[PDB]
Subunit: 299 residues, 3 copies
């Protein structure tokens, strides 16, 4: 029923541990999920949620990825890692028929936040139906610790029925090619980070949002309303020193961003793409901040 | 009649002065203005012009913002500062009914050029109707002086009547959600920086353009035709050292850019978004450069 | 017949030579070319191919540009250099009637990869019909050598007939203003870097792609499927140190990017804009990598 992935669904950080072999088990499932209130959609998912599970490795880690396809699936599924140096991002040999299972190993060489998605023809459809996720490759030593870590991805829903219409919705190839989505969604559904799973922090907390755009067509202008990003890893790269003091960051489709900020004032904060007509199409996130008032910063 | 804000309408720079309390008085006015020749539009404005007044403060400055709403206004108006660490950017407690007045104080902590806009439902409409501006927070010491400073913002007009049709134009909610504007405008109207207020500099002048995108939907690829930007503050951040020698800079909606360049050759220079079909929809700016010819640079 | 420019069509690199006068001869030709299989289009070209010839100079080089227009041409043609400090990028005095010839000289002052295009009204049409190219201004000393250098540009085709329809296609002004292209193309045509001229490298080679977007409307999210960019010159600037370890890079219309990467694993690699619905409209590139398998990186 609930396809929305929780933002707080984040693996524990890698410490100062040495490189190792890491096993990953991803299962591609097609299920009917809640897109909006009264509206259901035919989702293609990794592990039954949109986006797919956030993965967390170190540089030098050999990732042993297993991809199983559910028996009741109607489509061939794969996975393309942006962290991988492999033909098709390793999806060349991960074309899995419903029922079967394939496995490859790849080594992470570049630190940063990378997008993963299904790379089965047609790729734009598989992504749009919700088959996208992120893989974080932490550098040697790891990221400096913060109080809160969140996992947010932007996606497009190309439903045949118009926005506002209740009932069963299927993918529209016409809208896809026209690049005209009916719904813009954070983490799968409408109000996934609003009514369903609102982000929560306390006054004085440093928040790190692992943001990425599944797409598959439109770029995002990521902005937390009421906050300025202290540090931004542009395109989600953890090699070049980050940008400092940014209001809005351009995140391309298949791209990432590591946005860090300190919360100083209590209240409600809004996660939006600053193409704010999309906020009327479900692209709205809520960050509740509880604590004492800070009159020196805001009165 | 003339809603277009002049590019040369810039406050005098902050010197090396210490942090202080700065009062700001913004008045939200709805008035009929010239969108194009023969075409008028229902504008929602800050201080009667699009974009709103450019504000200029220092880091550590406590900004005392007063927002008055005109008695003849038909809408609730607010203001969201990207420079502010406050719920809704301070717009949570600046929802002003026509006739009333509210006031808050916030402290500027991050240097850079920040967008401000009305944040009253629906936000995309309020922005589109012309309620956007910029606030420059100068760092400790201030910006190095230049010969000319300009203030340019990009906006979209979602008129019900098609482009080319004369008469009274109103906002179209259908076009807004479709992200299909009839007009792309610099500083409010068509030919605002062309026929109305052309930019003017002399040979050898260093020019600084405080560029920002009101939007509310489309990003800009800022380019001055015939010039290369010497220094660009990406996303309008004045913390990280600027980029050097850039032709075209991606500016997202609700984002900024500080573009600096030296003018070496006399003639006409064109301010455009490099999505140059928009130049046929009013998104065109003129920079007249007068002086002697420089054959070593261009013959 | 074949309008597609080969990616391997790159001038030999500038060594450590001193600044000099460089002559450039560009001829604007209008010819019927293969857009897709069974589909032909009315192309406006520089030197008979899309994109135009890649030019290669040093900083301090005085570029003597000659622009000849073919006698059988039906349009006025010009050329706007982003590397030039000149009114209209030097296109102000390079408006050449079919049959005539004009010449100007300009000095390159800024290092980086710059876009060039025709700047004759209406500019968006001239670009869309294929009149765009790149000029690389190498810094003092030059770029570090790589094994392979490629030349790739993204363009839009606004055909009157829909995608899939065979026959003669002409430019549609309606689609242009609507920003709705039927075809997205790398280097002129559909399958230009796929079926026609596939990129080829060997295992262990460092590859440098001089990527740029002719446009004239849509931005690109450049991504090589199966590879991570080691170094990216953002907006194609060779002054500021490059970004490191990037998956997907936002390249604006009229903008550039110098993407470098090391190929470690044999197989097929895909050049795409990560707006992957465009990959169904011809925006697809192939990089064949031949050599021994590397099980440590990918198995
Ligand atoms: Cl899971
Ligand atoms: Cl004023
Ligand atoms: Cl040639
Ligand atoms: Cu799939
Ligand atoms: Cu991808
Ligand atoms: Cu308002
Ligand atoms: Cu905003
Ligand atoms: Cu031309
Ligand atoms: Cu240009
Ligand atoms: Er494990
Ligand atoms: Er479906
Ligand atoms: Er604590
Ligand atoms: Er106190
Ligand atoms: Er004051
Ligand atoms: Er109106
Ligand atoms: Er002087
Ligand atoms: Er002389
Ligand atoms: Er020569
Ligand atoms: Er034609
Ligand atoms: Er060798
Ligand atoms: Er071995
Ligand atoms: Tb704490
Ligand atoms: Tb002077
Ligand atoms: Tb070699
Ligand atoms: Y977990
Ligand atoms: Y603590
Ligand atoms: Y003033
Ligand atoms: Y002076
Ligand atoms: Y050659
Ligand atoms: Y060698
Ligand atoms: Yb993991
Ligand atoms: Yb099958
Ligand atoms: Yb609140
Ligand atoms: Yb001020
Ligand atoms: Yb009311
Ligand atoms: Yb001129
Ligand atoms: Yb050359
Ligand atoms: Yb003529
Ligand atoms: Yb292969």
């Amino acid at each position: 029923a609930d396809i929305s992935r929780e933002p707080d669904d984040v693996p524990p950080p890698i410490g100062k541990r040495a490189p190792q072999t890491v096993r990953v088990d991803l299962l591609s499932v097609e299920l009917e999920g809640r897109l909006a209130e009264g509206t259901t959609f035919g989702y293609w998912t990794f592990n039954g949620k949109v986006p797919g599970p956030l993965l967390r490795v170190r540089v030098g880690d050999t990732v042993e990825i297993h991809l199983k396809n559910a028996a009741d699936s109607a489509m061939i599924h794969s996975v393309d890692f942006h962290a991988a140096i492999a033909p098709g991002g390793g999806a060349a040999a991960l074309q899995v028929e419903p029922g079967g299972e394939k496995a490859i190993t790849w080594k992470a060489l570049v630190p940063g936040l990378f997008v993963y998605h299904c790379a089965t023809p047609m790729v734009a459809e598989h992504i749009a139906n919700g088959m996208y996720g992120m893989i974080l490759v932490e550098p040697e030593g790891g990221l400096p610790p913060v109080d809160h870590e969140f996992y947010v991805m932007q996606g497009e829903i190309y439903s045949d029925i118009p926005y506002g219409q209740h009932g069963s919705a299927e993918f529209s190839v016409e809208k896809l090619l026209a690049e005209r989505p009916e719904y813009f969604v954070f983490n799968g559904s409408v109000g996934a980070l609003s009514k369903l799973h609102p982000l929560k922090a306390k006054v004085g907390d440093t928040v790190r949002i692992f943001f990425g755009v599944g797409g598959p067509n439109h770029a995002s202008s990521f902005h937390v309303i009421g906050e300025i990003f202290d540090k931004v890893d542009l395109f989600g790269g953890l090699t070049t020193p980050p940008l400092a003091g940014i209001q809005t960051v351009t995140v391309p489709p298949g791209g990432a961003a590591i946005a860090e900020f300190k919360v100083e004032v209590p209240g409600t904060y809004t996660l939006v793409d600053h193409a704010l007509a999309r906020a009327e199409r479900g692209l709205l996130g809520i960050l509740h901040v509880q604590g004492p008032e800070n009159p020196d910063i805001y009165n």
